[PDB]
Amino acid sequence: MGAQVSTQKTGAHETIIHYTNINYYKDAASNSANRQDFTQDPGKFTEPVKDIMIKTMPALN
Amino acid sequence: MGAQVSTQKTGAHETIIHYTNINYYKDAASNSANRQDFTQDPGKFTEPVKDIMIKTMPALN
Amino acid sequence: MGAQVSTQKTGAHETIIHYTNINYYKDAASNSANRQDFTQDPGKFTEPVKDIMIKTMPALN
Amino acid sequence: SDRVRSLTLGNSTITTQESANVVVGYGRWPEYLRDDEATAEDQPTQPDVATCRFYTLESVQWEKNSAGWWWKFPEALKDMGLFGQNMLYHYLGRAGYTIHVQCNASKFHQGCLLVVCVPEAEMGCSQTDKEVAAMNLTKGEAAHKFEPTKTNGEHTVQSIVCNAGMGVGVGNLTIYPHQWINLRTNNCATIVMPYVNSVPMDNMFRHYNFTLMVIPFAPLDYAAQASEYVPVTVTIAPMCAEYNGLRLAYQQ
Amino acid sequence: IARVADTVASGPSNSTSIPALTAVETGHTSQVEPSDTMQTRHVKNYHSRSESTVENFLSRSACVYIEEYYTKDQDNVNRYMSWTINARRMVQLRRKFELFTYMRFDMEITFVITSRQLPGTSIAQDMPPLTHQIMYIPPGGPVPNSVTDFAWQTSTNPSIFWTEGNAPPRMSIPFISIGNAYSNFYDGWSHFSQNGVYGYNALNNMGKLYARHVNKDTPYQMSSTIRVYFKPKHIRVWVPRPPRLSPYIKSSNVNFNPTNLTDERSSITYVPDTIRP
Amino acid sequence: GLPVLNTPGSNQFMTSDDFQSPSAMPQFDVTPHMDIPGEVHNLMEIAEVDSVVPVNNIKANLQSMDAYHIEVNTGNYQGEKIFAFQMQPGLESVFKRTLMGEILNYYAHWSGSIKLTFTFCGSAMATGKLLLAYSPPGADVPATRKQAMLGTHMIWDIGLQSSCVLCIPWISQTHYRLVQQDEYTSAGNVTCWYQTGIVVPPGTPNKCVVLCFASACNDFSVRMLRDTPFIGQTALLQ
Amino acid sequence: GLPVLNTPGSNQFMTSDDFQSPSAMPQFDVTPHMDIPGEVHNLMEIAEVDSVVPVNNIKANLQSMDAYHIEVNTGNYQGEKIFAFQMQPGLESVFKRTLMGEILNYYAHWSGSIKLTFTFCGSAMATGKLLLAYSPPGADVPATRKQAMLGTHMIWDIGLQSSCVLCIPWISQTHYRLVQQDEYTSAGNVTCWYQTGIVVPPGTPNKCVVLCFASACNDFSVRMLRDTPFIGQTALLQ
Amino acid sequence: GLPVLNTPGSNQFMTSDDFQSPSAMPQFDVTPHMDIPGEVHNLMEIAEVDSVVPVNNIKANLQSMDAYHIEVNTGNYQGEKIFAFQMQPGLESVFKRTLMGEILNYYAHWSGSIKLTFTFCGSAMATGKLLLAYSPPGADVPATRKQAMLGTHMIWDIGLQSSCVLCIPWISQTHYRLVQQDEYTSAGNVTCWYQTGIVVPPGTPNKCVVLCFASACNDFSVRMLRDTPFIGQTALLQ
């Protein structure tokens, strides 16, 4: 089938950890949640300044 | 098996979106609806004229 | 598995029409009916004569 | 000039100097039944030019208070030359038809008709509690007319125009093969109807394949001394006429 | 795939091109678009007519019938159901099907059977799960005259046995029509003499459907209501037509009462003032 | 386990389903297959076999061989209809019980041509010509030979070849017809007349029997499985 | 067997599901497909067909052809509004019942442009120029020709070409609008005025009929399947 | 069919499951995606944004801007503690409601460092040095500057650079801590003192406001999803 093997979340016996998935429905809205999308970009809220500010330097000068 | 992978309808997280299907019954009447047949030809009802009419021109002349 | 793809019976949208099958039981008596065996030989009952009779000819002569 | 057009079928020919193109059914043109779609095993008969020709029906008068008219085919052509003779002697029939509605006036008259071909135009009864009679559905080449008001007849058809005698809106009849006859631009209307039915062939007396309706949306009007007589003539010619099941003529 | 047309960017104009001018007399529907009668900007339209498909439109279970049958043989209550299959007794689905003259498709039939115990002063029971039997009888087959008729043997007629509590029974059927397509409208008769039956009933004959309780009897009177649902699939439709305007009166013909073309209003120039600061 | 979702129609029991199921007798050694004569594969093999038709099914003969007898006499009988009946392979009382019709009653739809074989059982000295006509639906039943002659007919000349076949072509509007034929799915009628007459020598019977046989052609077929209305009961047999 | 775990929604019955199911009639031979004229694939093929619009839908004409009549007269009528209405393809009483609007009522969302075709049915001698304007939501309905002229308008000149199209562009904030349009999803209004006037020769009518047609463009589309509020009942029909 | 065995937990409904399910609206055309500014991917993006901390949360200021005011005065104030509080990002009333703490209340576990930014809002002429100390759990809260000075401290010198950051390092025994911190998962305290004092010129205020900001670092993270105890109701709203 259109099987798609992904990686499972670390277990309590770490340091065959993968699962299989197949969509049965025609609408993408039927698929399960995307609990594995780990994107980040705090810059939008933490550093929305026009002029890049270097940590080790004075904010104003 | 006789699996057949198709494309799913766009989801609310666009811009692995495919599903698998296998028929289990011997009669085609048992299969699911054909919700993905997008054919069109309005000409039958909107332009059933014998002489092609060019938009940018006079209907009669 | 020992999957076996066959052809489905014509649907109400003709003129992917195939299904898959796998036997799970050890006895052939467990399998589904053979609704697709189309053999014929009316000769046994309609023409059980010893001497071939040609339609366009006299039965007796 | 696409205004002028000529039609030739059999020993008949129609002329026009003020037409508005030609509507061809649902994009299809009349054609004989193919072998991979036939059911009747007997070899059909095809009179051709004998039945496929222009048949003119009784003219009708368009008046300032006219509400409309309607004909049912192939029934309406039961007494038309050899086309009607084949209907009697055969069990099955199949034809195309080229509807040509004529109606001329003058640059001083005004009005607008709606020539439409309604497949399976099943109609309702005046008295919703009773049924309709064939005699009230179609009466030969004699046209039935729509009324601007409700009808009361026992087994009569609800002739009230606004519902076209079908329980629908007249303004939506444009979804069927049609043309208009806007006197200020037109002079006639032609529609080539292909055989439309859920069966390869069918009886021509028992079944009314389609209904031709001529409903005016713009009332006929004019000034004094202007010709008050404005007739509307309907001409139709069968196409690719096939017949099956030959037997003793049917007694009407 | 089933995407909609995009709008080409248009600018000023001044030529002999007359896309706005035409003549409806030809029976031709104008193929004009905004860019032809004004200055437009380019727009990548991603909209899709995927849900306008005749398949997606008609492929949805809709109730087509409903009858009630009792368990005990008291009074003149019917202990079994009978029904001359057709979809002309439920205005909703009937109106959709009638948007087209001819139809061709397979169909998914689902049954929603529910039971109850009729009111009473002393009705303490303990009845086991009720099992029902739905039997389809194609035109000509023997019809049962009782809840114990031999016809319920279902020797060759398709039948379903369902027990309450479980998911509503379902099963698909092909294209039964003896014609090349189902007919929603038949402007003809059943007899060559142009009389007898007129319209739908003149040719359509999908047979009958019977139901009953397979349980012998209940201490106190109980009744069940079966609801039949139709869901056409693998659809094909021909010759579109004006939607039903007048309310449906009979389920055997198209009789109707002169209905208004639409709702009324003050005048042709009436437009409600919705801006009042 | 594997996340599953039960669909409607679960746990139900449809008499016409077709699933697999555990065998109550595991590893049972089926009795060796034996090649037996006359095996049937399709029921149509039976409906294609000629069977005597009880054309003379009048109340007085419903239980005698006279039901199959179709008398023909010597002498002037012009304008006289030897016999007639509708074309309802499964509904017409005449065909209703023949091998052919008997099978059609297990189905609701039928299509194809039919072979009506007529056999002259008179003496070897009797001669004659009969007109076997078939008129498709649409008009009244042929009242005269002329009317019948206008339809699909067969002029049978009695001679050494005893039998004569009148193949009724499938001339229908729709592809199929209901076994429980109504006026809509009418098939027509079949009328027999005297083309000439039955001449006979001295010292020879004047009345002769003509048997009728009916069977399906290679273009015949049934379609809607249903129960036959020719068998029932009021209680379990014992 | 295979360890399975049933997920919520099992054994339920959703009218809009789409699963496979056993056929009650195994190996049924479907009737041969026949190529019938005028096949529909998408309902939009219908909504794109012009249909007469009952602009003059006043109580007195709700059952007469006058409902479609849009009169125009000769003589000074400057400052007079020939007609007007809101842009609610499925809610506005004027469009509510047209082929277009009739279909939109089976859906809750709509988008795209609309083609309002106007046809002059006067005599061939009558002349004139009308101003067909369309004003997007935001301000009051044009009370004068100047106000209407500020919006998207079309100056129609009556002549040999009887019809004239006023394409109402899709100028909305959101991609879609509700068929059950509210103030938020307002579409605007359409008002018609006299650009000049209708001049006519002697011995010719002074009042003329102007029919209105409405249909969707190639950029139109519906989206939310729902039941139409134009049909109901109080009990099973018989 | 395929022999199956239902495992425990079937037909149940767990609010935190994640299975597939049939769409009630087949082939629905979702509205085109539009790139909108300020998209959030992880809630931590919010907890990393500085938010004013109500250090002066005394009953009399629970509804005034004084709740955020941290006064500092000129003159001898040696040995005086400017302010102090526990290190409970989600439990401490001081942080409990900040953007950071507000998010932690949707989780039961937390880990990482915290950035306490202090901004001097006095006049441009006012000068001074403050001692921002942080003492890990284990001993009593610093009663004197000497005791506080023994712990992780930051000597802030007021000048052109208005703000000064006191990063509280994650010095815990366990990898994570409970938002509902108890004595076991204690984090310590934060006390502010006068390193020197606030000297000011003539004609200049003697009292100044010092705002406090709190946010998470790049090493912060929450873990146990739970419901926030800062919102509830007694009946359906209307």
Ligand SMILES: CCCCCCCCCCCC(=O)O
């Ligand atoms: C096993 C149950 C069989 C039910 C047959 C239903 C056929 C429905 C046909 C509908 C015809 C029409 O709507 O024009």
